Each structure stands twice: as structure tokens, then as C-alpha cells.
Design an enzyme around this catalytic site. Structure first.
Site, PDB file in Angstrom:
ATOM      1  CB  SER A   1       2.191   2.671   6.071  1.00 42.59           C
ATOM      2  OG  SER A   1       0.876   2.798   6.376  1.00 42.59           O
ATOM      3  N   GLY A   2       4.400   0.180   6.331  1.00 48.19           N
ATOM      4  CA  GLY A   2       5.552  -0.373   5.613  1.00 48.19           C
ATOM      5  C   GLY A   2       6.719  -0.672   6.526  1.00 48.19           C
TER       6      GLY A   2
ATOM      7  CD  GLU B   1      20.892  12.492   7.902  1.00 47.38           C
ATOM      8  OE1 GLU B   1      22.143  12.696   7.832  1.00 47.38           O
ATOM      9  OE2 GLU B   1      20.085  13.103   8.646  1.00 47.38           O
TER      10      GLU B   1
ATOM     11  CG  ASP C   1      -2.118   0.081  16.975  1.00 43.42           C
ATOM     12  OD1 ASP C   1      -1.440  -0.776  16.438  1.00 43.42           O
ATOM     13  OD2 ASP C   1      -3.306   0.287  16.702  1.00 43.42           O
ATOM     14  CB  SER C   2       1.974   0.783  14.130  1.00 43.37           C
ATOM     15  OG  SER C   2       1.094  -0.199  13.733  1.00 43.37           O
TER      16      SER C   2
ATOM     17  CG  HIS D   1      -0.564   0.230   2.434  1.00 41.95           C
ATOM     18  ND1 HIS D   1      -0.298  -0.738   3.369  1.00 41.95           N
ATOM     19  CD2 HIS D   1      -0.344   1.423   3.017  1.00 41.95           C
ATOM     20  CE1 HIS D   1       0.095  -0.127   4.477  1.00 41.95           C
ATOM     21  NE2 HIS D   1       0.003   1.196   4.323  1.00 41.95           N
TER      22      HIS D   1
ATOM     23  CG  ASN E   1      14.758  15.652  13.265  1.00 39.02           C
ATOM     24  OD1 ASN E   1      14.126  15.871  12.217  1.00 39.02           O
ATOM     25  ND2 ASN E   1      14.581  16.363  14.348  1.00 39.02           N
TER      26      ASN E   1
ATOM     27  CD  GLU F   1      16.611  10.776   7.485  1.00 36.57           C
ATOM     28  OE1 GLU F   1      17.013  11.357   8.507  1.00 36.57           O
ATOM     29  OE2 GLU F   1      16.397  11.344   6.412  1.00 36.57           O
TER      30      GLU F   1
ATOM     31  CG  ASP G   1       0.037  -4.057   2.617  1.00 37.59           C
ATOM     32  OD1 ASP G   1       0.585  -3.524   1.600  1.00 37.59           O
ATOM     33  OD2 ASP G   1      -0.312  -3.441   3.624  1.00 37.59           O
TER      34      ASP G   1
ATOM     35  CD  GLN H   1      -1.130   8.998   7.430  1.00 38.24           C
ATOM     36  OE1 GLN H   1      -0.042   9.466   7.828  1.00 38.24           O
ATOM     37  NE2 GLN H   1      -1.728   9.521   6.372  1.00 38.24           N
ATOM     38  N   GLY H   2       1.446   6.541   8.751  1.00 38.50           N
ATOM     39  CA  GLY H   2       2.815   7.036   8.656  1.00 38.50           C
ATOM     40  C   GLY H   2       3.801   5.983   9.075  1.00 38.50           C
TER      41      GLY H   2
ATOM     42  CB  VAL I   1      17.451  17.903  11.419  1.00 35.11           C
ATOM     43  CG1 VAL I   1      18.854  18.443  11.684  1.00 35.11           C
ATOM     44  CG2 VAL I   1      16.340  18.814  11.936  1.00 35.11           C
TER      45      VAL I   1
END
Ligand code: F5R
Ligand code: CA
Length: 223
Positions: free
Chosen positions: A177-178, A62, A171-172, A40, A54, A52, A84, A174-175, A57
Site C-alpha cells: 500500500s502507498g 538509511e 500482484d501487489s 489509506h 532490509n 532501505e 487514494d 497488503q503492506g 537491519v
């Protein structure tokens, strides 16, 4: 992640952020050139951001690498979220170090009652919206298939498991995801779906990675 804790910079070295001009999904680095995420989370123009903490920043650990190819599972169903899972190939290999590291695929499926680490940069509220800039972590157990099926009648396939807390609060979201669900140093799940976030009797639902290991390995070997 609702009701989690700040992981600490680069303590989850396999976590990636998928960026299309902004963070939109998590993922897991499974070798120097491949990321696994949720189907998804598919879109064109992905940049994978490794190392990563932050996401707003540049902190100095990174690696930003464009995707060369995305492969969504052949049997992904966007209505049911069955299968999924997606693979992303990096244009060039990541430099691996103590802060950017691959996570092992499982040889075995994890049992109910196993404690896992879920991580991500998703919403931290069950009501309203607050997006953290730094990686959040949550320790949660895998729930029994019967408690998962009772929470989401008619929706749980053999390619899904529940993890979290039937009482709510953690919980986990939105955001996230994956992103990864890691148990005993192996990737067991992918943040897939749930009814709201951190609601009573509505735990998180995660893609069951152990069912996909042969597809992952054959796909990586030929792409
Ligand atoms: N664990 C959850 N409750 C959740 C996960 C991902 C998404 Br997207 C929505 C809800
Ligand atoms: Ca950063």
C-alpha cells in the site's frame, strides 16, 4: 508483492517505508522534502525511512526522518478509495545520492500496455502470510480501462487504473500500500487496492498519479 523478485539493495532509490514502530506502508520520494503515498496509509506519528533494503537491519544507507505534516487529498473517499493519495512533508530534507533519489512526476498519463515496476515489502503469498524483510519488485503492464472495469464492475473511477495479470499469480498485496508504480522513469501509480492478492481476473488497482500532478505541485509550493 506476490510472484515478484528481490529488487536488490537500493536499486529502487525512491522507495520509502512508512514506519509507526513497524513498516506499514510504502511511499515515493518526489523531492528532498516530500513523499507521496496512499491516503489509506494516513496515520499520525509517521517516520519515513529512506534508503532501505532490509527493513529489519540497519545496513548503512538509511535516512530516518519524521513527518512534519500529512495532507490527504481533499476528496479522498475511504469507502470507494477514490482519490487514494496523500502527501507527507519531511521535518528536514533528505540527502539525495545514487541510493536515495526522487522519482519524477509524470507529464503524461501512461497508456495501457506500458510496462511498469511495482515495489514494496508487502505480503508475498496469495494464501496465508509471509512478509519479506527485503524489497520486492514486480514488472507488470497497465491494463486497458475496459479490462479493469470488467474485473471490478462499478468500482473503477477515472482516478484508478489496473496493472498486473488477469491470469493471477503476480500482484501487489497488503503492506505494498502507498508504494510506487513507475513507468518509463515516472511515477504513474500508487498501490491502492484489489480483491485479495494475485487472484485470477482481479488485478491490482492503482491511483492514477497523472490526474493529481497540479494538486501535488500547488500543495508542495504552499506547504
Ligand atoms: N494489488 C492488490 N491485490 C492489493 C493491493 C493492496 C492491498 Br491493501 C490489497 C490488495
Ligand atoms: Ca535497513
Amino acid at each position: 508483492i506476490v510472484g515478484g523478485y528481490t529488487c536488490g539493495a537500493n536499486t529502487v532509490p525512491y522507495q520509502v517505508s512508512l514506519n509507526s514502530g513497524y513498516h506499514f506502508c510504502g511511499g515515493s520520494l518526489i523531492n528532498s522534502q516530500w513523499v507521496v503515498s496512499a491516503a489509506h496509509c494516513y496515520k499520525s506519528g509517521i517516520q519515513v525511512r529512506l534508503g532501505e533494503d532490509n527493513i529489519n537491519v540497519v545496513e548503512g544507507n538509511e535516512q530516518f526522518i519524521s513527518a512534519s505534516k500529512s495532507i490527504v487529498h481533499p476528496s479522498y473517499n475511504s469507502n470507494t478509495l477514490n482519490n487514494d493519495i496523500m502527501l507527507i512533508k519531511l521535518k528536514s530534507a533528505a540527502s539525495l545520492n545514487s541510493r536515495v533519489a526522487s522519482i519524477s512526476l509524470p507529464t503524461s498519463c501512461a497508456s495501457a500496455g506500458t510496462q511498469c515496476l511495482i515495489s514494496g515489502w508487502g505480503n508475498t503469498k496469495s494464501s496465508g502470510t509471509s512478509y519479506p524483510d527485503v524489497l520486492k519488485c514486480l514488472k507488470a503492464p497497465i491494463l486497458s480501462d475496459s479490462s479493469c472495469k470488467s474485473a471490478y464492475p462499478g468500482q473503477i473511477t477515472s482516478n484508478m487504473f489496473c496493472a498486473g495479470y488477469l491470469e493471477g499469480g503476480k500482484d501487489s498485496c497488503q503492506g505494498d500500500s502507498g508504494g510506487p508504480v513507475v513507468c518509463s522513469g515516472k511515477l504513474q501509480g500508487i498501490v491502492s487496492w484489489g480483491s485479495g492478492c494475485a487472484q485470477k481476473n482481479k488485478p491490482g488497482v492503482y491511483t492514477k498519479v497523472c490526474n493529481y500532478v497540479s494538486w501535488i505541485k500547488q500543495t508542495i509550493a504552499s506547504n
